[PDB]
Amino acid sequence: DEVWVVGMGIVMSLIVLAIVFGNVLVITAIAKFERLQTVTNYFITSLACADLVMGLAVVPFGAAHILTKTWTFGNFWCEFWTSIDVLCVTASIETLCVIAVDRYFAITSPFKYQSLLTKNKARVIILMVWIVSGLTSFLPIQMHWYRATHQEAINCYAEETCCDFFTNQAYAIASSIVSFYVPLVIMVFVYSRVFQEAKRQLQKIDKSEGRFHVEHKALKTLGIIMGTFTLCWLPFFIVNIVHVIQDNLIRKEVYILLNWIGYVNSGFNPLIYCRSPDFRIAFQELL
Ligand SMILES: CN[C@@H]1CCc2c(ccc(O)c2O)[C@H]1O
Known part of the structure; x- marks a missing residue:
């Protein structure tokens, strides 16, 4: 009366369904609607594209790998799958930083905002983001610049039915730095400044109209924006650094679980970044 195949399969299918449905609906x-076509919405389009490619490509095959415990395809497909996984992850995480910086420049520089950011510059920014994402994903993996040296890694690399992730110290550290830490620092600085500006505006209003009845909301919005990202992706990169720093500190199952925890963050992005009333009207019209 085992339920391993049935129990995990249902949840794994449901995650794919949720991701694909949400991203297709947003896209x-x-x-379809000319009202929502805005410079800000191009970054949302790029993020939705990255998460949709993730949900269609990396999750279904990882599900088969976990359920079956063998890689029925060749080694070339294993390498391609790893490359596309890294590409999608880094592209999404960098697009989040681009959105944060966009909001920073919108709020802290109101008079000059319409000047420095035009619809032409957004295309260049998105293209640069995707190119940088592709440089760290396909170029090192496809040229075997990330491979390990120990006997277990060699045996895994020399077998067609095995597909496991083995990497050396330099690639792991560089990939973690490029993918996670710099965007995290930039987002922290940006959102701290935005919170300061909002608090200053509230204090300004209070002095002017305090007598008549005329920061919970800002705290709630910033918490919803930041806490989910931190909880989804922070645990994985710490163990990513540790497992090459320390040989036997961390098991493989913990690594896989913390990797899969970050995958579901793609299904939450429409709930966070697409709650605008115009988006709700568009969703009502379509469905
Ligand atoms: C096989 N899973 C990979 C392993 C390493 C890695 C991931 C994502 C982003 C990165 O920058 C990485 O270095 C994970 O998706």
């Missing part, structure tokens, strides 16, 4: 809502 078609932005594309």
Whole structure:
């Protein structure tokens, strides 16, 4: 009466369904209606594209790998799958930073905002983000610049039915730095400044109209924005650093679980970044 195959399969299918449904809905809502076509919504389009590619490509095959315990395809497909996984992850995480910086420049520089950011510059920014994402993903993995040296790694690399992730110290550290830490620092600085500006505005209003009845909301919005990202992706990169720093500190199952915890963050992005009333009207019209 085992339920391992049935129990995990249902949840794994449900995650794919949720990700694909949400991202397709967001993409078609932005594309079909001319009201929602805005410079800010291009970054949302890029993030939705990255998460949709993730949900269609990396999750279904990882599900088969976990359920079956063998890689029925060749080594070339294993390398391609690893490359596309890294590409999608880094592209999404960097697009989040781009959105944060966009909001920073919108709020802290109101008079000059319409000047420095034009619809032409957004295309260049998105192209640069995707190119940088592709440089760290396909170039090192496809040229065997990330491979390990120990006997277990060699045996895994020399077998067609095994597909496991083995990496050396330099690639792991560089990939973690490029993918996670710099965007995290930039987002922290940006959102701290935004919170300061909001508090200053509230204090300004209070002095002017305090007598008549005329920061919970800002704290709630910043918490919803930051806590989910931190909880989803912070645990994984710490163990990513440790497992090459320390040989036998961390088991493989913990690594896989913490990797899969970060995958579900793609299904939450429509809930966080697409709650605008215009988006709700568009969703009502489509469905
Ligand atoms: C096989 N899973 C990979 C392993 C390493 C890695 C991931 C994502 C982003 C990175 O920058 C990485 O270095 C994970 O998705």
